Design an enzyme around this catalytic site. Structure first.
Site, mmCIF file in Angstrom:
data_model
loop_
_atom_site.group_PDB
_atom_site.id
_atom_site.type_symbol
_atom_site.label_atom_id
_atom_site.label_comp_id
_atom_site.label_asym_id
_atom_site.label_seq_id
_atom_site.Cartn_x
_atom_site.Cartn_y
_atom_site.Cartn_z
ATOM 1 N N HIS A 150 0.811 -1.210 0.000
ATOM 2 C CA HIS A 150 0.000 0.000 0.000
ATOM 3 C C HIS A 150 0.848 1.266 0.000
ATOM 4 O O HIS A 150 0.456 2.277 0.592
ATOM 5 C CB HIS A 150 -0.953 0.001 1.195
ATOM 6 N N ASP A 160 -4.338 -6.436 -2.242
ATOM 7 C CA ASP A 160 -4.470 -7.679 -1.491
ATOM 8 C C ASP A 160 -5.141 -8.757 -2.334
ATOM 9 O O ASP A 160 -4.650 -9.894 -2.427
ATOM 10 C CB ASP A 160 -5.262 -7.424 -0.210
#
Lengths: 443, 172, 443, 172, 443, 172
Positions: free
Chosen positions: C218, C361
């Protein structure tokens, strides 16, 4: 759980009388045993050396169903690594080809060098207070990689015979295409990839032992296709003699000829180039291999190619009822740009996903696979009896076990090799069984 | 922007493309062949995945041909179909062409127009075989003196890196 | 037929040294044994009590792969029934939520009351002359349903420990989100449902033991996203201390903080609300749990949530290579409408199917699952060695087994719990094995 | 019925939508961003199954957001894409937009038009990944004084109750 | 590998008390054992004799999952061959129906006569120098093909009882539809083919033993559909008596009536035709079978039909969770063209893929199959207790084992037959077990 | 070729077809029913594979009906839907109609036009059920004196030999 104990492979193949049971193209436990024992030990085609010319260049391919990356080292050598990180097995490389200095896992950030060493673990002192030994956590390396005249072959096992001993006599027929000129060969313009819904054994068997099918399957193409001089008519009409070599699972076949004529499909410029370089080809190889410009070859398990059209194919299994086709157009490195463009046009026109000849082959394989779903359609014996009992060894400079072109010695040998590999643990036993079978076939 | 055509020209060119697609769908191959110009060039390339650095620099991995046809090549494929020995098309497949997003622009050559469309080709073969091809197409159309149009060039883009159909036996 | 006898689970997991074999994410017999022993005995999340407020209100959910209906009784209690008729196993309810007085089978017409009793069989005197005992043919009832601070947990077994004894110490960390204010919590505006092509163990392991991945996966979101005051920078940069709890398969992790700051992703109004209610939160819970507004938690097997963003997730397994995600946005029942809208906007912007953070993810899990098809890609050991041997028990009011945030105690505990449940028949043996493992981990 | 537009207005608005779709397909994200108006509202909701009594009464189970974006939000997503660290779009996906059933109606606000279309979005990712999104879209277009158009509002409807793709990393 | 040894079929069916376990609709090894023992030995419907009227006419159908071709010989008889070549198992015929003189394999070119003999192998003298015996390599022939009043039944086995002995008493009820007039029956206008995602046992059980479902599933059609005189109201409202026959897996059921009235769905002209020909029908058959114009019938395993609507259906299994429906509209050969058009319109309007009545049946079967994925949804007992213990033999000219129409004697008999066939090797043991069960059911 | 219509007539007929499709999508069945003419004929046949000799001669294996409806038949299906006891449509399916390749030609009957389109019907049912129907449709439209249009005839072609959906509970 897969338990090979209750399997009995030898009951599905009868190479002595020439019969086969079509269940082998459908059984999934058979496919898992194949993935474990056939593709886990036999040499597999990785790439051509002209696709990784400089240090740090890589190429993404497969070895079975496993993703593999082939990268050129800093000293000149070539290595192959299983495309999988050591932390949650994430994929480290995604492109087809390119130049890189390190492989970076996109999930957490572990970085590897182009020689497979782990060079950067983010926040090692905090995350690993007891210390992490970076040496044990390098990329998974293929223990056996070897190049032959430009083609790179990899092998997962280490008890297998070397590439030369494994190829055996098929090298004599492969040199006829690899060793025509001075300066080797090279790949021209990209790879064609597609998917065919058939077991991987159908194309292997066809390219190892079937020239017969070309009489009736490709009749429309012969009618319609056959501006420099091409071949007047298909070779099988006017050919004086013929030859098919089948041994250790490898197969080859062609027609003898009096002039360097390719098939009718090739463009005129390709035939003109072959006629021009016939002199050099004869000087290097000989009379038989320089006039050989039309035929079929196959190296077990999945390396197929054709001579005149200059097309090479690799067959990746995807389950027991699918296969993926990778297609290469390989020419001579000493040619000119116009001849290379002509080669590309001819190969992609003739044997692409939309070529006049691959159409029927793919359709027929798909139809066989569709028919094989039923219970009685996969328990009925078939006929492998073509040319049975006519095997002989020539003595005029062509090695191996031979037969007429319309025969199935190559297919029977391939099936015996496959059944011997599936039913044996060590490579030595495979070699002993194959030697016994080759002793039997001549008597 | 380019000097766009009026309403009537767009209507005429769109109707011409619709009629060509209908001809391909109605299995009138000779008429479709008669709709093409003499110097047609009917190409199609592969598609590859490049590295981020390669994408930024503008570098791409090598590609190749899937279609490279002149008019005689298309004639030759049609004549292969007409023999009845083309086992890849027995029985023939049933195809539908959906043409959308028709954008028409002029060209410095007099009376030759450039067209960009999106296409969805639905190919259904015998007994539960379906395939969808989705992509874009850059065509060119020439207007003759007889108020009729001819396909001067066609470039096809297929968005699959690994084509999932065992063959492409149908014309796009 | 599935026979667990030839399976040996313990050979695929090495929790002492921190190694794992990736076959467990692909084997189908493993998946069937999971459906039989993991989801058949462990407590599973059904719904929040604010979705069935009045008598006769129902909600359609899953418990494993089984459809289940949760309905509020007439006296105030809650019951759960297997969504299947007793005559040809037809589905009796199809909607998502609503109010009903009876469930009517659409195939023949058998009708059931909201308490599972069979109240109407059409033409009983004719069709059943010998008499039908309506008592034995009631709906299949879940023998164990219990509510905890608003969340309803169901269990198929009856020999399992109660919900409190099963949760154990994770209740201490769950109260930090459920018990912030007076009046409980409530769900805001619907459920998000989608499908990810990965085994269900990947998201469970990530939400139980992975905060490390947020450093590199991220990074783009941190760069781009970071009009009331939000957090200046991600917490891991400025945090003074950190903590990860892992025990009995449950996991939690967060960073210590000096002021009530959530992560950078949350909208300004959410942070303002948390700052406002910090006083009450500290009064009820304490200093540590009132400043905890950023972290990850997971209750075995499939109940995941995050603190600051106020997002809750449930993971339904669909085969060995798929999972379905149900996502809830839960806020405090005592808030205002504008704050609730801000919470909804923040949660759906950050962690939806199109949120800045779930993208990576899901992509990574799908890539791992795609790579796992090959034979050598699922037989190579991985590394679970992060923070090994550094487990300690705190003595400042935080219970359980602890470690630094960048470690894998939680994942190792979860895998040991999973392997212990798969390899044991009765719950008592599971408890004994877990107690022995927890004794071993400290020495 | 509503006071419909003439032929020319329909032609212009349809061409504008086609050009926007082409910009999204040609990976020119900055230009597409420059095509939008300042007060854009780019929403999308979920879809649920209701009881027959609920359908007749007009009652529906609760829904939620999938997209709720202003112009700065879309800018921010594009800037996330431009960093090269967006692992969800490396390599980028190849998408095609098919726009059909274009219905254009006026609005009481001067020089603002309402548009309803049906859309098919084909998203192909690397190595045999395909996804089809089919639905309807209610847009609004504002005409400026420079003969150019701007997208003032966009509402998207997706007809899947349980979305079958792990993410929506592409703009509709 | 499929090993039936660890399977225990009898534990999943309880025909004495009327219970069933829904696992049988999902287990794949059960499906393979079915393909081996149910469809491998029982008589299966091939085609109607009016679709192959002249010599050389063929029809392409299935027998299980196996493609089969049915061709009319030169002397008048009918033969059936497995649609598979003897050289690589390629499909020799692809069309639906037509006239042919030889079947030509499109892959290599082997040609077969319409009686299955191998008549042309291209290049036999070269390809087969040792000689090929064309007699052993003929097409695979179905050893048992027999016609009954126009319907052709084939069987792979040869130890099974003949078609008459296998049909038994269901012939009495089948003659009521086949033998109404002079000149037999014939098929009108094509076949409807589609796919339903359900196990093949659901439609068989419904058409063998379920008239009950028509009370509540088809209530909307009864409301909306019910210009010559049709039936005033559905028969079950006004019927005086009822009868259901269930034996050896075959089932039938109907309501007694006082006038020749079909159901309400049929068009007016069909009812007028039946009223007109009632006299001849009574003359040939009798009073009971001439007034029978509404009901359901099923011959094990997959031959279903309805009386008044004149519709016939065949159920081809495709895996354990799919089925393919073939639908025929069969009328009397002595009718006129307008009546035949009316019959076609009525049948296709009522029972097509878009007919008012098939909608709900297909939807319900698909819903049951979708629910059956979970582990607890396929291990819960169901109720087969309708009309249990009320079986009696009539003595007024109607043969077999009888019961009231709202009962499940037929379904229990079918399940007992299926479990007996799956669990026994020879047909004699099947017959002995069925005789013992029929002795038990009466006492 | 046929004496084609002008621009305005094509625009009007295309808009009418779009509105009909929108009515079918918006679950306004009574209004759609009110859009049809009294003598509507709403047919659909099966599709078969013929031998090469049969194809050349023009012979085809026998076919049958899937739809054979007058206006009262369609009314009757709608009234079956309205009862709430149609378990095949509880909950109702969500469908989208994409209409393309609109070709409009005149007819010797005054004020009756013939239309040929290609259609893609996307039918999504509850919880991950999707189906695509692709084909062609030959409609006829009658213009009344009130400037409004009515559907006089509709012929539908479905290109699947073996239909892969358990039922067709939605109108095409």
């Amino acid at each position: 759980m897969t338990t090979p104990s209750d399997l009995n492979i030898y009951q599905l193949i009868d190479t002595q009388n020439g019969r086969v049971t079509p269940r082998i193209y459908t059984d999934p436990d058979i496919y898992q045993l194949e993935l474990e024992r056939i593709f886990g030990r036999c040499w597999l085609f990785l790439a051509h050396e002209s696709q990784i010319p400089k240090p740090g260049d890589f190429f993404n391919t497969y070895m079975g169903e496993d993703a593999v990356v082939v990268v050129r080292q800093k000293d000149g050598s070539i290595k192959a690594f299983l495309n999988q990180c050591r932390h949650r097995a994430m994929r480290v490389s995604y492109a087809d080809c390119g130049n890189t200095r390190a492989f970076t896992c996109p999930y957490h950030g572990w970085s590897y060098g182009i020689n497979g060493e782990l060079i950067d673990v983010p926040l090692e002192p905090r995350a690993y207070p007891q210390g992490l030994c970076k040496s044990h956590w390098g990329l998974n390396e293929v223990p056996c990689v070897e190049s032959y005249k430009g083609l790179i072959f990899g092998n997962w096992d280490t008890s297998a015979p070397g590439l030369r001993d494994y190829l055996g006599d098929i090298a004599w027929y492969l040199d006829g295409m690899l060793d025509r000129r001075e300066g080797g060969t090279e790949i021209v313009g990209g790879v064609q990839k597609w998917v065919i819904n058939c077991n991987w054994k159908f194309p292997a068997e066809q390219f190892a032992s079937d020239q017969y099918h070309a009489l009736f399957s490709h009749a429309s193409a012969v009618q319609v296709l056959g501006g420099d001089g091409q071949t007047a008519r298909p070779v099988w009409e006017t050919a004086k003699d013929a030859l098919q070599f089948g041994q250790d699972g490898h197969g080859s076949g062609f027609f003898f000829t009096e002039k360097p004529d390719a098939n009718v499909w090739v463009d005129g410029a390709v035939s003109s180039y072959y006629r021009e370089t016939y002199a050099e080809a004869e000087q290097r190889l000989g009379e038989v291999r320089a006039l050989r410009l039309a035929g079929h070859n196959n190296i077990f398990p999945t390396l197929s190619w054709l001579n005149g059209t200059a097309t090479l194919r690799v067959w990746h299994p995807r389950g027991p009822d699918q296969v993926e086709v990778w297609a290469f157009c390989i020419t001579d490195k000493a040619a000119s740009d116009e001849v290379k463009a002509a080669f590309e046009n001819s190969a992609t026109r003739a044997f692409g996903p939309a070529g006049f000849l691959e159409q029927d082959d793919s359709e027929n394989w798909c139809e066989i696979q569709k028919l094989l779903k039923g219970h009685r359609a996969r328990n009925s014996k078939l006929c492998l009896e073509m040319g049975l009992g006519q095997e002989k060894r020539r003595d005029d400079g062509i090695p191996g076990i031979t037969n007429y072109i319309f025969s199935e010695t190559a297919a029977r040998g391939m099936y015996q090799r496959w059944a011997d590999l599936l039913s044996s643990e060590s490579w030595q036993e495979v070699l002993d069984k194959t030697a016994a079978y080759q002793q039997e076939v001549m008597k | 922007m380019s000097a766009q055509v009026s309403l009537e020209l767009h209507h005429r060119i769109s109707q011409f493309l619709f009629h060509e697609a209908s001809l391909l769908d109605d299995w009138k191959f000779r008429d479709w062949l008669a709709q093409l110009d003499e110097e047609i060039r009917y190409t199609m390339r592969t598609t590859v995945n490049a590295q981020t650095r390669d994408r930024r620099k503008g570098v791409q991995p090598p590609t190749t041909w899937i279609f490279n046809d002149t008019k005689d090549q298309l004639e030759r494929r049609i004549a292969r179909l007409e023999t009845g020995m083309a086992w890849a098309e027995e029985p023939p497949s049933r195809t539908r062409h959906l043409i959308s997003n028709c954008q028409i622009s002029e060209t410095d050559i007099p009376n030759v127009f450039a067209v960009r469309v999106n296409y969805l080709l639905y190919r259904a073969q015998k007994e539960r075989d379906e395939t969808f091809y989705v992509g874009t197409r850059f065509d060119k159309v020439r207007r003759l003196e007889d108020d009729n149009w001819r396909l001067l060039e066609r470039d096809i883009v297929l968005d699959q890196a690994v084509i999932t159909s065992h063959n492409l036996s149908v014309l796009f």
